[PDB]
Amino acid sequence: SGNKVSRQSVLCGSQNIVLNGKTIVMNDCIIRGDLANVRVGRHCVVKSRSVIRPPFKKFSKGVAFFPLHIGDHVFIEEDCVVNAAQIGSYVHVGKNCVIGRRCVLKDCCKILDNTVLPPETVVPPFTVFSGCPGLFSGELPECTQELMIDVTKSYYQKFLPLTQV
Amino acid sequence: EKTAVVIDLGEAFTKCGFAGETGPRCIIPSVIKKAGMPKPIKVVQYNINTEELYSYLKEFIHILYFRHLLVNPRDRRVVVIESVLCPSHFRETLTRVLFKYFEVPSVLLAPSHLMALLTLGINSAMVLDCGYRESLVLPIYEGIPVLNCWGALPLGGKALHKELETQLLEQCTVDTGQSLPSVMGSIPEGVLEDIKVRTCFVSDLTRGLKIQAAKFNRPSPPPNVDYPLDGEKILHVLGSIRDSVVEILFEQDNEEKSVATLILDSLMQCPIDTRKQLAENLVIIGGTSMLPGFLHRLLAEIRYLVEKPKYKKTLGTKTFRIHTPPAKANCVAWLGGAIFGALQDILGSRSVSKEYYNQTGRIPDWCSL
Amino acid sequence: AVVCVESEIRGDVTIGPRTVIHPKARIIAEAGPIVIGEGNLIEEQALIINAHPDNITPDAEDSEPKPMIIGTNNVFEVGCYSQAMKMGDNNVIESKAYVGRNVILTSGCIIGACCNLNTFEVIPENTVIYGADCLRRVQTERPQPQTLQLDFLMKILPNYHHLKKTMKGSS
Numbered sequence: 039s040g041n042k043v044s045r046q047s048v049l050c051g052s053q054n055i056v057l058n059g060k061t062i063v064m065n066d067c068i069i070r071g072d073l074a075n076v077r078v079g080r081h082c083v084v085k086s087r088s089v090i091r092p093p094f095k096k097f098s099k100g101v102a103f104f105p106l107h108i109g110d111h112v113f114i115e116e117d118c119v120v121n122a123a124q125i126g127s128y129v130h131v132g133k134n135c136v137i138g139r140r141c142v143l144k145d146c147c148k149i150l151d152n153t154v155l156p157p158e159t160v161v162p163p164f165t166v167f168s169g170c171p172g173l174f175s176g177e178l179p180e181c182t183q184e185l186m187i188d189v190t191k192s193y194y195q196k197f198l199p200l201t202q203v
Numbered sequence: 204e205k206t207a208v209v210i211d212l213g214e215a216f217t218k219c220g221f222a223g224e225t226g227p228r229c230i231i232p233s234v235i236k237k238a239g240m241p242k243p244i245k246v247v248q249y250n251i252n253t254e255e256l257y258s259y260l261k262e263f264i265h266i267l268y269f270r271h272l273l274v275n276p277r278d279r280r281v282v283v284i285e286s287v288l289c290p291s292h293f294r295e296t297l298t299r300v301l302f303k304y305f306e307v308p309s310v311l312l313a314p315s316h317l318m319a320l321l322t323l324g325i326n327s328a329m330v331l332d333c334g335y336r337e338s339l340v341l342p343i344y345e346g347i348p349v350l351n352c353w354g355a356l357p358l359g360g361k362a363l364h365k366e367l368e369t370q371l372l373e374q375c376t377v378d379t380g381q382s383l384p385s386v387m388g389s390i391p392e393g394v395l396e397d398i399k400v401r402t403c404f405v406s407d408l409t410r411g412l413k414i415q416a417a418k419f420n421r422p423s424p425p426p427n428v429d430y431p432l433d434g435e436k437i438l439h440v441l442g443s444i445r446d447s448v449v450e451i452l453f454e455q456d457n458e459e460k461s462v463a464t465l466i467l468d469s470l471m472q473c474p475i476d477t478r479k480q481l482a483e484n485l486v487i488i489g490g491t492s493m494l495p496g497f498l499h500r501l502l503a504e505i506r507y508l509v510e511k512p513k514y515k516k517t518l519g520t521k522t523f524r525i526h527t528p529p530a531k532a533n534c535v536a537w538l539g540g541a542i543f544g545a546l547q548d549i550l551g552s553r554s555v556s557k558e559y560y561n562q563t564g565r566i567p568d569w570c571s572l
Numbered sequence: 573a574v575v576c577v578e579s580e581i582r583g584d585v586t587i588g589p590r591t592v593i594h595p596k597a598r599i600i601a602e603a604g605p606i607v608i609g610e611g612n613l614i615e616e617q618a619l620i621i622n623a624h625p626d627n628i629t630p631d632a633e634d635s636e637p638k639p640m641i642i643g644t645n646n647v648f649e650v651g652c653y654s655q656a657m658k659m660g661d662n663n664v665i666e667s668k669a670y671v672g673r674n675v676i677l678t679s680g681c682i683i684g685a686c687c688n689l690n691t692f693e694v695i696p697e698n699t700v701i702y703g704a705d706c707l708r709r710v711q712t713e714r715p716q717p718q719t720l721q722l723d724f725l726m727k728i729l730p731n732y733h734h735l736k737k738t739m740k741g742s743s
């Protein structure tokens with residue numbers, strides 16, 4: 039629970055939640071993603087006005103799609119509807135982006151802004167996905183990912199004292 | 204050993220291939236669209252700088268074989284395929300990239316027409332070259348190109364798109380998304396070309412005569428064949444405009460310009476020991492001209508112009524054939540050069556090395572050796 | 573139907589059976605009586621509208637007196653709104669679909685992601701649009717209004733059925 043300890047927002051889905059350290063997010067978002075199992079991640083990041091959900095049912099023998107997996111030094115952005123996302127560490131989402139069904143990415147997922155993923159959007163490690171559908175545009179440097187993520191975490195923690203609520 | 208590279212000079216597409224590769228590999232549009240690029244950069248950019256184009260070539264080739272097969276071309280040879288009329292400075296700039304930047308083992312220029320002949324491997328043949336911007340009838344008698352029998356109509360695929368945009372810019376018979384008649388100016392070239400390329404069936408000669416009648420002082424142009432649109436604006440108008448393109452494709456109206464015209468020109472430079480041979484050799488090829496049902500309009504115009512009074516003396520009564528292509532769409536020269544480069548380890552000596560290019564840096568065409 | 577307490581409705585909306593409205597299902601059916609269908613699932617963050625008022629100002633003889641309707645198996649997902657969509661049999665609306673005003677949604681309607689519906693466009697049957705390619709009439713028969721896309725909709729409706737009983741039990 040090393041996030042922004044302040045009266046910011048509320049949500050639900052306490053199935054397999056986790057309040058880890060160095061991982062924080064902003065307000066205006068809702069968390070309704072307990073449709074399948076969960077996997078949170080410390081040192082991550084996210085912006086305001088977002089939404090996330092898991093893949094499908096997974097209650098009966100017909101299990102769901104790839105619902106969720108998070109990582110370290112990750113950085114989500116605004117308006118990113120993370121629907122059915124199982125990714126790794128040092129991920130990077132963009133503005134107005136969305137995750138597609140059965141998306142099973144890996145570490146350092148540079149999700150482009152205003153991009154979305156299609157059904158069964160399993161991505162590889164140290165990649166850079168983009169497009170209306172799931173499309174790995176390029177790649178990403180892992181060292182620069184962890185370094186810039188920590189630098190951004192400190193810079194955001196600097197201005198984090200704003201809105202004492 | 205190993206494979207090789209098979210790349211030709213295409214304004215629209217320059218595929219790559221290996222040695223003796225049976226079946227196509229990968230086609231990509233010749234223009235280079237990069238990051239933060241508002242409009243991609245072409246290839247036919249002459250009298251332009253060399254460093255910027257040089258760079259574009261470097262990274263484009265780089266990612267080209269990367270996304271093709273991620274191979275290391277510093278290990279195998281290259282089969283360069285030509286397309287005449289291009290400035291040799293450009294070609295040598297490509298070579299400059301290749302050797303002075305990438306250092307491949309050896310490269311080798313080659314004619315596309317050769318590979319076209321290799322599709323059948325016969326000695327004498329006509330050349331029904333129909334490229335992307337021009338055409339060419341430069342026969343290969345005895346497996347040897349016929350020099351002065353040349354000519355080109357600068358009215359290929361690109362100009363066809365220009366014709367399309369002209370016609371449709373004149374009339375926007377589509378709706379809004381109510382008709383939006385010539386409201387905006389820019390066009391979706393991809394959509395336009397999708398309509399065009401996805402609907403290229405050639406019509407009857409009689410229909411072309413109807414078009415000619417419509418030029419001055421019309422019998423049922425629909426059922427018109429033209430492919431759906433987008434942008435909330437789709438329509439079903441006369442697809443007969445593409446047949447109008449087929450009519451303007453061959454103009455005799457104080458122009459006397461056609462493919463048969465170049466065949467006649469060749470005939471003018473042809474000696475008696477070439478005439479009947481070419482009458483046999485009715486070679487059926489052409490790159491961009493993948494025109495469905497063109498046999499009708501084509502053959503009809505051939506056997507329509509045979510009747511020209513100034514050419515019966517030249518022709519007589521010559522019949523022709525159909526030298527059908529065993530290859531496909533445009534893979535003809537591609538796969539022709541692929542199998543042509545297969546066991547040409549012998550000709551690997553003829554493939555220009557970077558070794559000699561160090562002390563040389565030049566490949567001579569018809570110059571002083 | 574699952575008349576959720578969190579499902580914010582507004583106005584006279586004579587709903588139909590099996591219209592399970594999920595939590596935070598903000599809607600409006602006052603200026604137009606929107607009747608629900610049979611076999612849908614109104615998810616979270618939706619936005620059902622009725623008779624676009626004078627902010628846009630229809631200065632074209634405003635004498636509407638017309639109510640909205642719905643159909644069977646037409647479950648609309650989260651993010652997407654509903655700007656008086658005259659739906660039908662199995663017209664699913666996926667995430668973030670910008671619903672248009674006059675779009676008579678027929679059967680086999682797969683409203684893809686971020687696909688702003690076309691105003692005053694008769695949405696015919698058996699047509700699934702592409703995401704980035706707006707108005708893509710792709711899959712004219714694969715996305716068939718009956719037995720193919722509607723069968724897939726009824727198949728997706730099974731998870732909605734299990735979720736309907738589960739949400740009725742969880743509440």
Ligand SMILES: Nc1ncnc2c1ncn2[C@@H]1O[C@H](COP(=O)(O)OP(=O)(O)O)[C@@H](O)[C@H]1O
Nearest residue numbers: 213214215216334335400403490491493494495
């Ligand atoms: N059915 C068809 N009829 C006519 N042209 C076609 C048809 N199908 C494809 N084509 C065109 O043939 C062209 C091949 O062009 P090409 O000769 O490869 O250009 P370049 O030589 O510059 O690469 C393609 O651009 C395509 O638009």
